Amino acid sequence: MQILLANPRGFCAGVDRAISIVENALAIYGAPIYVRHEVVHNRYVVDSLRERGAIFIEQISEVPDGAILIFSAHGVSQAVRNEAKSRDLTVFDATCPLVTKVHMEVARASRRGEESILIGHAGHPEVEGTMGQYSNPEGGMYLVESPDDVWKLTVKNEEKLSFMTQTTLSVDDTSDVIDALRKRFPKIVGPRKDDICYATTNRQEAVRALAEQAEVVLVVGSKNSSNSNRLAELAQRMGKRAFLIDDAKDIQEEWVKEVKCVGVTAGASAPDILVQNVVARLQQLGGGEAIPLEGREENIVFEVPKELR
C-alpha cells in the first residue's frame, strides 16, 4: 500500500507560538499556569501540557488571584479580557496574530457603530472572541454560517455594512456565503476574499491534491478542531473515505484493507509525532515508505512575546 503525505500539513505558526507560550511560561514561573480554553484543539498537546502543570479553564472565575493566565490561540472576547484585567492576573495572550487581525477590524466597525457580519460556526471559541469585539449598541454584529443564513438576515443600515470571517473555514463554502452577502447587500465592505488564514487555505489546497491520489485520507486532528474537520470534509466531498483521528490507535484496519494508496494529513494543531505514529501503524498494516507530496512552501514564524523568551 502506498502512503502519501500532504504538504503542507500539521503545525502552523500561530499554534507553534501558542504552545511555546504555555511551555515557556511553565519554564519561567513553574506550575500551575492557567490557560483559558484548550491552548490549541489537540488532545495530545492539551494532555501533555496538563501533565506538566497547565490548568485549562473556560471562565476567569475558575482562576485564583495572583495567577498567570494565558488566553488560547483562538482569542477571547473583550468581556473576557476585561474580566481578566479587572482581576489580579498576570496575562499573556497566545491568540494567533491572524485572529487578532480580524478582532481589530470588528473593533474598528464597533467604534463606528457600523454593522458587521461574521461568517463562522456558532459556539466556536474563535467566533465567540471575534463576535465579542463588538460592543456598540448603536450598530450590530451578526453571525452567519451559510447562504440560507444570509437569505434571512435583516440589518439596520445596509449602506454601512462590513463582513469578516473565521480563520479556519472551508475556503469554498465561505466563497458561497460571501457571494450571497454581496447579492443581498451590494454595498457590503470586506477583505479582498476572506479572513481565512494562509495555513487553512494551504492545508485545504494540499488535502485536495492528496485526495486526488489517495483512496482513503486520514486527517490527524481532534474532534473539536475546526480546521482539522474541514480537511476531512474536503476529502469526503471528493468521494474519498476520510477519517479524523487523534492518534494511530484510532486507525481501524477495515479502513485500509486492500486499499492501494492511503493519504495522511494533519490539522494545524496536530504535532508531527502523531503523524509519524500514524505512518508507523499504516506500515504495520502493509504500507511502504511514506512519500511526501510536493507542496507550497510556508515560511512564516510568529515569535513568543519577549517576556517569555
Ligand X SMILES: C/C(=C\COP(=O)(O)OP(=O)(O)O)CF
- The binding site for dimethylallyl diphosphate comprises 41, 74, 124, 225-227, 269
- Known binding-site residues equal 12, 41, 74, 96, 124, 167, 197, 225-227, 269
CA–CA distance, 283 with 279 (Å, rounded to integer): 6
Question: What residues between 183 and 212 interact with ligand SF4 by CB under 6 A?
Answer: 197, 199-200
Which single residue is written with the C-alpha cell 488560547?
72
Does position 21 interact with ligand SF4 (CB under 6 A)? The reply is no
Candidates 23, 38, 115, 126; catalytic one: 126
- Smallest gap from Cβ 148 to ligand SF4, in A, equals 26
Question: Interface mask (CB under 6 A) for ligand SF4, residues 54-83, using x and -?
Answer: -------------------x----------
Distance CA 261, CA 236 (A): 16
Least Å distance, CB 138 to ligand X, is 30
Judged by beta carbon, residue 126 or residue 215, the one nearer ligand X is: 126
Q: Which helix (H) or strand (E) holds 145?
A: none
The answer to whether 45 and 274 are in contact (CB under 8 A) is no
126 counts as catalytic: yes
Instruction: Name which position in 13, 231, 234, 290 contacts ligand SF4 (CB under 6 A).
Output: 13
3-class SS letters over 261-296: EEEEEECCCCCHHHHHHHHHHHHHCCCCCEEECCCC
Rounded CA gap, 48 and 42, in Å? Answer: 10
Residues 6+ apart with CB under 8 A from 284: none
Nearest residue to ligand X by CB is: 225
The set of catalytic residues is 126
Site of interaction with ligand SF4 (CB under 6 A): 12-15, 73, 96, 98-99, 167-168, 197, 199-200, 227, 268
